[PDB]
Each structure stands twice: as structure tokens, then as C-alpha cells.
Design a protein around this ligand. Structure first.
Ligand SMILES: CCCCCCCCCCCCCC(=O)O
Length: 288
């Protein structure tokens, strides 16, 4: 038995970790109104993506990996000698990536594919990859890993803010948010993931109070966990995520793991400018 762990690009793992563990990635893409298509990777300058989105008369669209991209990656790993492939996917509630990766796995001969629905995105999805890799090194078998990731999923989540719901409304990735869209004053929406979908949580009077609300909501949840990893997941306002990261480092005991990450282009296209997430996992994830 020889187990590989792979993922799609929206896990937004650092290039350092992708390099160290040779993590294969099925990339998603974003298409601009001028017909320019860009596949996700860590060579794309995120600042350049935000500049093009700002200069776009129409919001860019995104695309999951094609089923043939999964198949090509599975065939490559099989032919290097892997017998089993763990696949960590973006939430099935917001993308067809997961179901595609499962159907691709059914079609590929000579290798076992174990597709896993993270029910989240960004480095929270990425934590499932890092957990799976750790378990493979410890000698676990694929079904034990899948069982452990399924348990991890029960104590994982995220809250987030955006400047405006127009990007999420345009793509249909905000669930049950009709009355707020285009009806906000200074008030800022706080959103959260629930069972793989993005739903409203609270409306707050200002952005600064919304960032305070992210911290309060998450700290109230994770105080009941035996282990805690928090991720600040920042969008285009560097100082917003950096401020929250530093405040978490002050407010939290060192027994909590507190880390910083950023959204890539595909998630940015759906959030728009001003996105900022606080994610949590009730595990001590190996981040090195
Ligand atoms: C804190 C994590 C926040 C993640 C925000 C995710 C916003 C929705 C992204 C949807 C990507 C769909 C990709 C596709 O299938 O085309």
C-alpha cells in the first residue's frame, strides 16, 4: 500500500508545503470579461488579480477542475506506484469540484480513490490535507484517515465578512440572504459556513465591529475544544487581516495555534473586495 494525498487549488496551501510534501493540485480557473483565462497557482500575483477584478466592468466567473484534470492526476499518481489516493476537495455546497473528483475516481483503473468533501475552503480545507499527510506518515490506512477527517469536520468551521454581497449574490454562493443584498447601509454582514454552504449570521453597524464580531463568535466556539487551530484568512485589505491576526495572538493563550493565510483568485472572485475570514479546527494541525 502506497497512499498519496492531493487536493484542488482552493486549499491555498503555501508553496513551501506543496513543495515539501509534493502535493499534486487539480487547479480551478477564473475567466475575465475580456476572455482572459487564468488557472490558479502560487505564481499568480494576488495583487494583480484584485487589480483586474477592480478594472472589470463584469465580475469574473470561475470554473471547477475539469473531470479530465482529475483523471490525469490520478493516472499520474497510479503510474508512480500509488495504490490509494486521498483527495481533499472544496465544499460540495459551493462547487462541483468534489462530485467531479469522485466520478473521475470511479473511472480510473488500477488505483483506489478516496474523495473527501471538506465542506469548507481555503486553508481550512488545506488543514484536511495536512492532517491526511500526517496520518499517512504515521502508517494509517485510507479508511482510518477518512474516518478521522470526518470526525475533524464535526469541529471545523469559519465566519467571514465581505464589503458587499454583490459578488456572492451574482454567483449564487450566498444562501438565504435576499433582504440584505443591496439593502445595507453602513451595516456589514457577518456570514458563516454551515453544512458546506454560506449563510448569514449577523448584521453589524461597522466594519470594525464586524471584525470584533468574527473574533467573538469563533472564540466562543473553540473554548470547548481540547485542541485549537485558528486561521485568519485575508483578502485584499492586508491591514485588516494583519490586525486581526495580531489581536488573536494577544487575546489567545499560546495553547491555541494561530496562523495567517490569504484567499486566492477563485475565492476572491466570489467574495469581492474586503473579504476576511476566521476559520477554526478543533485539532492541532501540523503546519510545518
Ligand atoms: C473562510 C473561507 C471563505 C471561503 C469563501 C468561499 C466563497 C465561495 C467560493 C466558490 C468557488 C466556486 C468554484 C467553482 O466551482 O467554480
Amino acid at each position: 500500500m502506497k497512499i498519496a494525498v492531493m487536493t484542488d487549488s482552493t486549499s491555498y496551501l503555501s508553496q513551501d508545503l506543496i513543495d515539501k510534501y509534493n502535493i499534486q493540485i487539480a487547479p480551478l480557473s477564473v475567466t475575465f470579461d475580456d476572455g482572459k483565462n487564468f488557472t490558479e497557482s502560487n505564481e499568480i500575483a494576488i495583487e494583480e488579480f484584485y487589480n483586474k477584478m477592480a478594472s472589470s466592468q463584469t465580475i469574473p466567473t470561475t470554473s471547477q477542475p475539469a473531470i479530465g484534470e482529475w483523471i490525469t492526476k490520478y493516472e499520474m499518481l497510479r503510474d508512480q506506484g500509488y495504490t490509494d489516493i486521498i483527495v481533499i476537495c472544496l465544499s460540495s455546497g459551493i462547487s462541483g469540484s468534489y462530485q467531479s473528483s469522485y466520478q473521475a475516481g470511479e473511472m480510473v483503473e488500477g488505483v483506489n480513490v478516496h474523495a473527501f468533501d471538506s465542506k469548507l475552503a481555503a486553508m481550512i480545507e488545506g488543514c484536511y490535507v495536512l492532517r491526511a499527510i500526517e496520518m499517512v506518515e504515521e502508517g494509517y490506512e485510507p479508511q482510518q484517515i477518512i474516518d478521522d477527517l470526518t470526525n475533524m469536520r464535526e469541529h471545523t468551521g469559519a465566519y467571514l465578512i465581505v464589503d458587499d454581497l454583490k459578488n456572492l449574490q451574482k454567483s449564487g454562493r450566498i444562501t438565504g440572504a435576499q433582504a440584505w443584498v443591496g439593502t445595507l447601509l453602513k451595516m456589514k454582514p457577518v456570514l458563516k459556513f454551515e453544512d458546506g454552504k454560506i449563510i448569514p449570521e449577523e448584521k453589524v453597524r461597522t466594519k470594525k465591529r464586524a471584525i470584533q464580531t468574527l473574533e467573538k463568535k469563533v472564540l466562543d466556539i473553540v473554548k470547548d475544544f481540547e485542541e485549537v487551530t485558528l486561521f485568519v484568512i485575508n483578502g485584499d485589505h492586508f491591514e485588516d487581516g494583519q490586525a486581526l491576526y495580531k489581536k488573536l495572538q494577544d487575546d489567545c493563550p499560546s495553547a491555541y495555534q494561530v496562523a495567517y493565510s490569504e484567499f486566492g483568485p477563485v475565492v476572491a472572485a466570489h467574495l469581492g473586495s474586503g473579504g476576511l475570514g476566521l476559520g477554526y479546527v478543533g485539532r492541532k494541525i501540523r503546519l510545518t
